[PDB]
Design a protein around this ligand. Structure first.
Ligand SMILES: CC(C)C[C@H](N)C(=O)O
Ligand code: NA
Ligand code: NA
Ligand code: NA
Ligand code: NA
Ligand code: NA
Ligand code: NA
Ligand code: NA
Ligand code: NA
Ligand code: NA
Ligand code: NA
Ligand code: NA
Ligand SMILES: [Zn+2]
Length: 866
């Protein structure tokens, strides 16, 4: 399979302006009739090249003439000798029931639904399946009325009828031209929650959430979140919904999270269905963010779309930024920022050091479904947030306004967005653009000097990005480097130079530069890279007491968290080295005292406290190291938890009890208390066994909501408490019928520290709630094992690698997109020791030799083995 390259982009030889689709729907055999109005832009001798995958072509007509001048080739229908303007008619057949890959038109339980992004429409009919071809769609759906009483596509209903033999039909029209990735069709029998939103200017919008029969009890929060998203986009961005109906359909079988199809979003049910006994606080907040995300795409993605798939971050980075801002404005901004930082440093940094490393605007792609990445999404959003930091809110919004004014109704590029920001604000972003074309994480090194004679403080800041496997050449970036300087009482020292204020966002644009500050009356403690102002590794030689000082005094909640992370990082590293030498955990008394102070500080927001008291994950720990020892990291994490549980026992219990709440509410103050209480519970679980067992068992049994029940269950598993097996069985007996709820349980099994975890996981492949046919189940059992239990995955006998090989051998054929997500832990082999590396390479070579290796896997495997 051949790579495609960004620099090869060329405007299409033909456009399609309007397409009329008819589907004669049936799960075994669906007949598609597609009538397109086309226009030639290129040379008169250029053929029309249509994409198509696994279609059975029935006929081809041009202006109602059966056509002879065409050929099928691999992935294509090539049509020659055309007029300049014509009507193309294609008839073809497809088979939804055979579609295990869940790309194109497929079955989800008894429903039929589509997934077209990135290149799935070509699995439905022969088309210009490229996002710079925007057309007006009309869609007629004909189906069995009993089996498919709801027939939905984008837009509004324009026609409806009933036929003989139990069939009926509905035709839809969407007035906005769209690329075909935004096409959707759904057919099935649903319960429908109906509501309304009235936009600021008075447009009335019918809101319709479609869920499987019997799930209406789990729909209101998603509907509430949709209305919250619509109000927020109006208040913050000045954007209103542009159509008359907003449909969301929740489907159980879905490879990703959710999809912004215009007026007809299709969601993984995981990001729709919640009630207090089935869903945790984190599930509620994920629903809210994903509902918001897809909604936000209506402007950033749909009204302005992507010229080509290399521009994916134009919509994904921007829309992630918007979802984060939405979450942050409605909820705790500090907690949102902390968690987005944890993702960046712990999961995205690892990708940017991997064989799959790419810039946020990639240059080369084999399979575009492989580039729906942490880099494109999360690092993309950090790049947008850097623009926001450089411009300020008002200028950023002027940029958004200029972007839409220029590009509304068109497919645009990352560069067009940057230019809009630059033009609206008059901030020069020429150098800044390199963030789009350069991969890897910059390392920023800071040294300081305080001169008491002149009362000047000097920061010497250097940057470099290490070469990555994709790019041998790197240059300095325009790094917005936010600082704050604290005096000995914890007060901010005004930044100034030569008698004028200096902006606290430093423009670090060179390999090395110095910044000098005047009137610095006390040696400062710096807060550096404030609110993670650029997506960089910071190297500054902090003393422990500078960090604990920041934990007590820093003005932004984020900086207090971050200082705690820097303090812990030193001792994590220490103790991994010690583990390798067979020595037990060592931690200074003063480090423990810093965490005790957080627990007893009444002035700290409990949301902030909870996050300081949540240890970095094993993924975040791994990025502290050049070579990862995943067993040492897992055992050090557990030992640190046990040490703090012992040293802080009485305080932990006291805070645990003080944050008890009898009423459950999905409200941010309540969520914050509960997060703190359950952070305390995690340590208490790892304390003296009898007390731990009683506390955990009681919380599980008395919980009035899934957040509390799961936090108890998860603690019983992590600490291997006596009550564990009984609680796990109780959960299974109560919830086995509910796949979303069982996913939590599969995660706990897959991430268990028990010595026989792999044997248990393999056994769970036959569990009543597990199926290889369902991406959520795969993720929750297999994916959690490979990706979230790196200790067991990287077991020295190589058993974790062999297990993943077997699963991937199945999934390569069944569902290559899911396969490719699951292979990611194996392609990190160069971060591990020689003996692991050998075993991981042997596993990759086995997969490389699969019959019918998917392009999705081929791309990753060949990068990994290079
Ligand atoms: C591949 C698609 C399901 C991704 C979707 N456009 C998103 O917003 O994440
Ligand atoms: Na198939
Ligand atoms: Na067009
Ligand atoms: Na009707
Ligand atoms: Na298109
Ligand atoms: Na907020
Ligand atoms: Na492809
Ligand atoms: Na410029
Ligand atoms: Na110094
Ligand atoms: Na220093
Ligand atoms: Na350091
Ligand atoms: Na099963
Ligand atoms: Zn998106």
């Amino acid at each position: 399979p051949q790579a495609k390259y960004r620099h090869d982009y060329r405007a299409p030889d033909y456009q399609i302006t309007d397409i009329d689709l008819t589907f004669d729907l049936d799960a075994q055999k669906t007949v598609v009739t597609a009538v397109s109005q086309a226009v030639r832009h290129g040379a008169s001798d250029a053929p029309l090249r249509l994409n198509g995958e696994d279609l059975k072509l029935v006929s081809v007509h041009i202006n109602d003439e059966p056509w002879t001048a065409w050929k099928e080739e691999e992935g294509a229908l090539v049509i020659s000798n055309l007029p300049e303007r014509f009507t193309l008619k294609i008839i073809n057949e497809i088979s939804p029931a055979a579609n295990t890959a869940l790309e194109g038109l497929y079955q989800s339980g008894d429903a039929l639904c589509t997934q077209c992004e990135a290149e799935g429409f070509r699995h439905i009919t022969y088309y210009l399946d490229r996002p710079d071809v925007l057309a007006r769609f009309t869609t007629k759906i004909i189906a069995d009325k009993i089996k498919y009483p709801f027939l939905l596509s984008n837009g509004n209903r324009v026609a409806q009828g009933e036929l003989e033999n139990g069939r009926h039909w509905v035709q839809w029209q969407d007035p906005f031209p769209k690329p075909c990735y935004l096409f959707a069709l759904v057919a099935g029998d649903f319960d429908v929650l109906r509501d309304t939103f009235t936009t600021r200017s008075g447009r009335e919008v019918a809101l319709e959430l479609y869920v499987d029969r019997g799930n209406l009890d789990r729909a209101p929060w998603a509907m509430t979140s949709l209305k919250n998203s619509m109000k927020w986009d109006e208040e913050r961005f000045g954007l209103e919904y542009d159509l008359d109906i907003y449909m969301i359909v929740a489907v159980d079988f879905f490879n990703m999270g959710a999809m912004e199809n215009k007026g007809l979003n299709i969601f993984n049910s995981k990001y729709v269905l919640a009630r207090t006994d089935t869903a945790t606080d984190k599930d509620y907040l994920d629903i809210e963010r994903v509902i918001g995300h897809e909604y936000f795409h209506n402007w950033t993605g749909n009204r302005v779309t992507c010229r080509d798939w290399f521009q994916l971050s134009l919509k994904e980075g921007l829309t992630v930024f918007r979802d984060q801002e939405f979450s942050s404005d409605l909820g705790s901004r500090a907690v949102n920022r902390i968690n987005n930082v944890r993702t960046m440093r712990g999961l995205q940094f690892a990708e940017d050091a991997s064989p799959m490393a790419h810039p946020i605007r990639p240059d080369m792609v084999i399979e575009m479904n492989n580039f729906y990445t942490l880099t494109v999404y999360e690092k993309g959003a950090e790049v947008i947030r850097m623009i926001h930091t450089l411009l300020g809110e008002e200028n950023f919004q002027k940029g958004m306004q200029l972007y839409f004014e220029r590009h509304d109704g068109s497919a645009a590029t990352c560069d067009d967005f940057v230019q809009a920001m630059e033009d609206a604000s008059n901030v020069d972003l020429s150098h800044f653009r390199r963030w789009y074309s350069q991969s890897g994480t910059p390392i920023v090194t800071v040294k300081d000097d305080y001169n008491p004679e002149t009362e000047q403080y000097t920061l010497t800041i250097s940057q470099r990005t290490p070469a990555t496997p994709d790019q041998a050449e790197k240059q300095p970036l325009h790094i917005p480097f936010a600082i704050e300087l604290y005096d000995n009482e914890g007060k901010v020292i005004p930044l100034q130079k030569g008698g004028h204020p200096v902006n606290s966002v430093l423009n670090v644009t060179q390999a090395e530069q110095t910044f000098v500050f005047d009137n610095v009356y006390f040696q400062p403690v710096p807060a550096l890279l404030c609110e993670f102002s650029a997506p960089v590794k910071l190297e500054y030689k902090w003393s422990d007491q500078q960090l604990t000082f920041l934990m007590r005094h820093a003005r932004n909640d984020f900086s207090r968290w971050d200082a705690a992370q820097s303090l812990l990082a030193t001792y994590i590293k220490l103790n991994v080295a010690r583990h390798q030498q067979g020595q037990p955990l060592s931690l200074p008394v003063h480090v423990a005292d810093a965490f005790r102070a957080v627990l007893l500080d009444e002035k700290i927001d409990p949301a902030l406290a909870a996050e300081i008291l949540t240890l970095p994950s094993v993924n975040e720990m791994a990025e502290l190291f050049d070579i990862i020892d995943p067993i040492a990291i897992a055992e050090v994490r557990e030992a640190l938890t046990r040490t703090l549980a012992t040293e802080l026992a009485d305080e932990l219990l006291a805070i645990y009890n003080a944050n008890y709440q009898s009423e459950y509410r999905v409200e941010h103050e309540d969520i914050a208390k509960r997060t703190l209480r359950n952070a305390c519970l995690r340590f208490l679980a790892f304390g003296e066994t009898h007390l731990a067992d009683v506390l955990v068992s009681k919380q599980f049994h008395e919980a009035n909501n899934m957040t509390d029940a799961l936090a108890a269950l998860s603690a019983a598993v992590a600490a291997q408490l006596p009550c564990r097996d009984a609680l796990m069985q109780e959960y299974d007996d109560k919830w086995h019928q509910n796949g979303l709820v069982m996913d939590k349980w599969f995660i706990l099994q897959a991430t268990s520290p028990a010595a026989n975890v792999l044997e248990t996981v393999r056994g769970l492949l036959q569990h009543r709630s597990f199926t290889m046919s369902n991406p959520n189940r795969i993720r929750s059992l297999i994916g959690a094992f490979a990706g979230s239990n790196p200790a067991a995955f990287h077991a020295e006998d190589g058993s974790g690698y062999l297990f993943l090989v077997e699963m991937l051998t199945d999934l390569n054929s069944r569902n290559p997109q899911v396969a490719s997500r699951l292979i990611e832990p194996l392609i990190r082999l160069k971060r591990y020791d020689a003996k692991r590396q050998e075993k991981m390479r042997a596993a990759l070579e086995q997969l490389k030799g699969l019959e019918n290796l998917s392009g999705d896997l081929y791309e990753k495997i060949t990068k990994a083995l290079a």
